[PDB]
Design a protein around this ligand. Structure first.
Ligand code: XPG
Length: 1175
């Protein structure tokens, strides 16, 4: 009865409930312990399977782990199902007292009361057994999931570096998110796989006693259904699993869309991704309609099946020459209610939920069986033996205390591979490695995890102010922490997205120093800070402070190599040299009306009511036939009675099926419509909307909220509506047969709404608390997998495992409160139902002078159903009301403000732009109407085929100028392009016909064709011409196809210079006169960059060129340069003359480049000026 929650409900009505308030689970369910129990039997199973020389079975481990405990609960199943078959036989005796009634017999009146007490006792026994069983199997299910997730995490810590090549982080995280949650549904139903068939046999015997040989026909239909519903259950699981391939591909496209949306806009590619998503969605909904219609036929099987089974049974019974009496019919009808529940719901539900679990156990088995001084001599190793060449060859080196080793060479030279060899992550194929002392591993990609920055630094070490502050200053971190409002206690995101790159890098590095290790493997740590901070970190921390320790420093900063004791140059893998909360009716009306014309939704309501009325009327018709037969040689004309009866069952079967299918049609159509609306709105929504949201907050709408609307929500409505209309049926038949019942009902109804409200006040707190507690788990796994390298290097695995157990058992507390609260509530709705069953039974005996046998048989046969039905109905209603938060979260995106039309009715000439001139008149710009002006007063002219660029301080509007030409947010003032006003041509006129090389490139998933030509407008040989112009041909021809080859995911198989060259290829392909070049990005190689600059100058010599210069040399060829400051055009003049104007800002900046570079620029400026002056 869960009384221990009662004070928490009181607390949750006086207050909102909070995370500290929930009761902790037993020490026996602690995730640390609970995982080791299954890990042990998996070890044993691997041993056995080994000795047998066979594949191990994870199903074997799980049974050999849990079977002892879970087979005990079958005792409740046995006594529950024993009561369900007893209770109808007593009901037969009550109705008997009516069939043979006389008011005079005191002893009979007393006898009937005795059975009314036994029938009431059975009901209360059954109510508590139902709750003791269903509460325990849900806790057995929860234990299995926790043990699973502990094992999945345990393995993932130790995975092989090669294994990371054959399953991605997101797929591992999909195990926890989507695969393990199938286990909670396994344990709930298994015990029905034997109780169902057994109960079928027991009921077969009893019905043989009640109505003789006809018993077989009813069971004959049941053995037609039991295969069929199992076959449907298998095919449903086949269909559903195939949709996962479409849905995951769709979501990965949405991720590259929403992450990339600025560039997709700038290239006007929106048509491409619109079509591509539309086709994946059109395929996916092709399966989801089909998979849904199957599942709707499964629920329409439960609803209708009991009426078919009864109909065939009584059909044979009257042809065999029998006559109906009310005791026989309502005993028979009542028994089939038992077999209907277990065999038709719980045996199919067991089969399909076990079948679905094997899909998860199969994947998890495939995951669990994945692979799992400093002196180096003659070292050679392959990351993948399949490679034709070694990643390190004939390496020999050694480093001793006080030595600093600089590791130098090109990108992919093997420097990081050298560090991996030191780390032991790359084992030798020949040669040897020996290390003594504690390693300090500074990964090239900084690793930062959720917590405090101080938690990131301490990393389990004791806090000590002096050394800690010495690190904070030595890692040049004091200033930032003083700028932060919460200091070192500031909260950090899953990946430090709230932190700058140099911040996360410096925090990582500070962490390394805090450990006070012996061997420091510094992998390019200084590249993420400015030159002043870079040399401050090198000189004080690396040269002065870490001096007493072995250091190997993978660096490109040649400026520091003079301080190294020894330098190792690697090339081509070998050593070169060594020296909310509530929704309103509007959201329901929209969700249904979006799906169809009102003619459909009103027809749907008339089909529902027709189905339910026919369902009630069949049973009333039996009762009426019983009364008639009991009123009477002479006999009823079956061709009348059996006639009309056939119609009522026929209508029930028909509208039951139509009802179930049509709900899925209307609601899936609704979700199809809302997805396209939402997607059109997300395409045409301006960039500003994507700055005011993080990517995950948008992508959740498409991944989760559309997910609920397609799969789970339409089922939940159908499940609710089938139940709810039967509840209204029970109450309506009881009140119609014996009106006086209306009086007790009133207080009982008031108690129901008081009870309901008092629970629901807390329910929306537990649901929230559960949902908020769940996410940190997946966050931790993601952080851990990213840090896999480093966490492993520090030997920190045991702490991280304990942290995952901490998060996991937290959610176990939340889930445990959710379980117990739902049962506290469900128990008492059964208690209200028991009061209803009591009042019906006793009231009928009070009023016995007025009722008659068929009437009482009907009233009771309905009231007995209520116990399971009513407690479920109200708890489904709380799920519908939760999921409508999804439908409200998508509906708000359907109406986001829109960018101005892609095309006006005014359109430019197909030859426009002809001349490639641009003019600015008094323009001002800001990213949003509410914001400050970022650029102001500006006016300028660009002539045909001029070469110019933009310089200034950061935030001067450099990025704003490119944003203005594209009208990403509308301008103040005027810009003309080719004598026509930019605001008067459509965005697809304007954003095409100019070209923009972005600072950071993007490779979309797909073919090299699509990544170069999504329109297939360029001729088949032109890409080879363009590819030859970037000279990428001799690399890409090595792919499995010369063209139309698949790229790797995100183009990860190409290096940054190659990626940028693909963007240069895109520029080469489209022919338009106007080019803006974005700023050069970080760590590009020092050779292809000059090639790019040379090729740009060579090929686009006939274009009008702007540029945003990261470093000035990239544009000192230009005719004129614009100088911005404080959001205003300071200077627009020739670079030479600017350098002549020593007062110019341009000179005031170039003076900062140092005497040598200043002199070089002086002479080269004079030279190019002379060259320009000659003609
Ligand atoms: C369990 C899968 C959904 C079944 C939906 C179906 O419409 C029937 C539901 C009722 C039925 O009318 C009588 C009955 O006992 C079902 C409700 C109990 C289903 C199992 C959940 C038990 C619980 O949580 O208390």
């Amino acid at each position: 009865f869960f009384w221990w929650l009662n004070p928490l409900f009181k607390i949750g009505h006086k207050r909102r409930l909070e995370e500290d308030d929930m009761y902790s689970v037993l020490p026996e369910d602690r995730s640390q312990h609970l995982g080791e129990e299954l890990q042990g039997y998996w070890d044993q199973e691997v041993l056995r399977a080994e000795k047998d020389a066979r594949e191990p079975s994870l199903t074997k481990a799980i049974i050999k782990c849990y079977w002892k405990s879970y087979v005990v609960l079958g005792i409740f199943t046995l006594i529950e199902e024993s009561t369900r078959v007893v209770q109808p036989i007593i009901l037969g005796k009550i109705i008997g007292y009516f069939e043979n009634y006389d008011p005079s017999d005191s002893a009979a009146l007393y006898e009937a009361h005795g059975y009314a007490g036994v029938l009431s006792a059975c009901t209360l026994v059954l109510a508590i057994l139902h709750h003791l069983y269903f509460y325990h199997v849900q806790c057995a299910g929860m234990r299995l999931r926790v043990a699973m997730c502990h094992m999945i995490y345990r393995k993932a810590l130790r995975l092989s570096n090669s294994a990371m090549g054959k399953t991605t982080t997101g797929q591992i995280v999909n195990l926890l998110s989507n695969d393990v949650n199938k286990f909670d549904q396994v344990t709930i139903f298994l015990h029905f796989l034997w109780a169902g068939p057994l109960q079928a046999i027991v009921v077969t015997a009893l019905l043989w006693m009640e109505i003789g040989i006809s018993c077989l026909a009813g069971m004959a239909v049941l053995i037609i259904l039991l295969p069929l519903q199992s076959c449907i259950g298998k095919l449903f699981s086949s269909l559903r699993s195939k949709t996962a391939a479409f849905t995951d591909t769709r979501i990965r496209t949405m991720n590259e869309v929403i992450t990339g949306i600025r560039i997709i806009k700038m290239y006007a590619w929106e048509k491409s991704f619109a079509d591509l998503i539309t086709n994946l969605r059109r395929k996916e909904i092709s399966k989801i309609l089909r998979s849904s219609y199957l599942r709707g036929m499964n629920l329409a099987s439960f609803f209708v099946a009991s009426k078919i089974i009864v109909f065939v049974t009584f059909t044979t019974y009257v042809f065999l020459g029998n006559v109906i009496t009310a005791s026989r019919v309502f005993v028979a009808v009542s028994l089939y209610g038992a077999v209907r529940l277990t065999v038709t719901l719980f045996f199919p539900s067991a089969v399909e939920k076990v079948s679905e679990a094997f899909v998860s156990i199969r994947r998890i088995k495939n995951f669990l069986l994945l692979d799992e001084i400093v002196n180096v001599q003659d070292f050679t190793a392959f990351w993948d033996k399949a490679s034709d060449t070694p990643t390190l060859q004939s390496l020999s080196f050694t480093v001793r205390p006080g030595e600093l080793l600089a590791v130098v060479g090109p990108v992919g030279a093997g420097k990081s591979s050298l560090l991996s060899a030191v780390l032991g992550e790359l084992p030798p194929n020949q040669g040897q490695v020996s290390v003594h002392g504690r390693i300090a591993y500074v990964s090239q990609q900084p690793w930062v995890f959720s917590g405090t920055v101080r938690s990131n630094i301490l990393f389990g070490k004791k806090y000590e102010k002096e050394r800690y502050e010495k690190v904070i200053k030595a890692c040049a971190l004091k200033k930032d922490l003083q700028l932060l409002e919460d200091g070192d206690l500031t909260m950090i995101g899953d990946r430090g997205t709230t932190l700058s790159g140099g911040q996360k890098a410096r925090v990582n590095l500070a962490r390394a120093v805090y450990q006070d290790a012996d061997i420091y493997l510094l992998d390019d740590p200084l590249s993420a800070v400015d030159a002043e901070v870079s040399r401050h970190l090198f000189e004080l921390c690396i040269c002065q402070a870490l001096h007493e320790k072995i250091r190997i420093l993978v660096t490109h900063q040649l400026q520091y190599l003079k301080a190294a004791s020894q330098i190792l140059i690697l090339k081509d893998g070998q050593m070169v040299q060594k020296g909310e909360g509530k929704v309103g009716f509007k959201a329901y009306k929209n969700y249904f009306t979006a799906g169809a014309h009102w003619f459909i939704i009103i027809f749907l309501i008339l089909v529902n009511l027709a189905a339910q009325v026919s369902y009630i009327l069949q049973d009333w018709w039996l009762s009426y036939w019983a009364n008639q037969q009991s009123a009477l040689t002479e006999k009823l004309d079956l061709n009348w009675y059996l006639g009309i009866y056939s119609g009522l069952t026929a209508s029930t079967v028909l509208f039951g099926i139509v009802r179930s299918l049509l709900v899925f049609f209307v609601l899936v159509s609704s979700s199809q419509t809302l997805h396209n609306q939402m997607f059109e709105s997300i395409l045409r929504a301006p960039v500003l909307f994507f700055d005011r949201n993080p990517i995950g907050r948008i992508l959740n709408r498409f991944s989760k909220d559309i997910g609920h609307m397609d799969d789970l929500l339409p089922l939940t409505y159908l499940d609710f509506i089938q139940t709810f209309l039967q509840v209204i049926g029970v109450v309506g038949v009881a009140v119609a047969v014996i009106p006086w019942i209306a009086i007790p009902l009133v207080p009982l109804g008031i108690v129901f709404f008081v009870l309901r409200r008092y629970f629901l006040e807390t329910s929306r707190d537990v649901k929230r608390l559960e949902s908020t507690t769940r996410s940190p788990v997946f966050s931790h796994l993601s952080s851990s997998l990213q840090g896999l390298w480093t966490i492993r290097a520090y030997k920190a695995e045991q702490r991280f495992q304990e942290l995952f157990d901490s998060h996991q058992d937290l959610h176990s507390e939340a889930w445990f409160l959710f379980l117990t609260t739902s049962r506290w509530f469900a128990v008492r709705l059964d208690a209200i139902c028991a009061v209803f069953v009591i009042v019906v039974a006793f009231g009928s005996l009070i009023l016995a002078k007025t009722l008659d046998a068929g009437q009482v048989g009907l009233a009771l046969s309905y009231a007995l159903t209520l116990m399971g039905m009513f407690q479920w109905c109200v708890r489904q209603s709380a799920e519908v009301e939760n999921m409508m938060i999804s439908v409200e979260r998508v509906i708000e995106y359907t109406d986001l403000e829109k960018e101005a039309p892609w095309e006006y009715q005014k359109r430019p000439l197909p030859s426009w732009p002809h001349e490639g001139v641009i003019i600015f008149d008094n323009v001002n710009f800001s990213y949003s109407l509410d914001g400050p002006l970022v650029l102001k007063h500006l006016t300028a002219l660009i002539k045909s085929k001029e070469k110019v660029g933009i310089v200034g301080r950061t935030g001067a509007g450099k990025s704003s100028l490119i944003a203005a030409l594209f009208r990403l947010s509308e301008p103040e003032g005027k810009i003309w392009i080719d004598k026509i006003l930019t605001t008067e041509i459509g965005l697809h006129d304007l954003r095409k016909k100019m070209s923009i090389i972005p600072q950071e490139p993007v490779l979309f998933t797909g073919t090299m064709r699509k990544n170069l030509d999504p329109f297939n407008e360029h001729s088949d040989e032109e890409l080879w011409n363009a590819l030859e112009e970037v000279q990428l041909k001799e690399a890409i021809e090595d792919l499995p196809g010369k063209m139309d080859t698949e790229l790797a995911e995100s183009g990860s198989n190409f290096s940054v210079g190659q990626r940028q060259l693909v963007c240069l290829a895109r520029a080469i392909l489209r022919k338009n006169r106007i080019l803006i070049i974005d700023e050069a990005t970080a760590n590009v190689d020092p050779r292809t960059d000059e090639l790019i600059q040379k090729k740009i100058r060579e090929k686009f010599a006939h274009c009008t060129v702007l540029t945003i210069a990261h470093r000035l040399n990239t544009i000192i060829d230009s005719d004129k340069i614009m100088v911005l400051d404080s959001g205003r055009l300071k200077e627009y003049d020739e670079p030479y003359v600017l350098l002549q104007n020593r007062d110019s800002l341009f000179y005031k900046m170039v003076q900062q480049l140092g005497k040598a570079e200043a002199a070089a620029l002086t002479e080269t400026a004079k030279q190019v000026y002379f060259k320009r002056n000659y003609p």
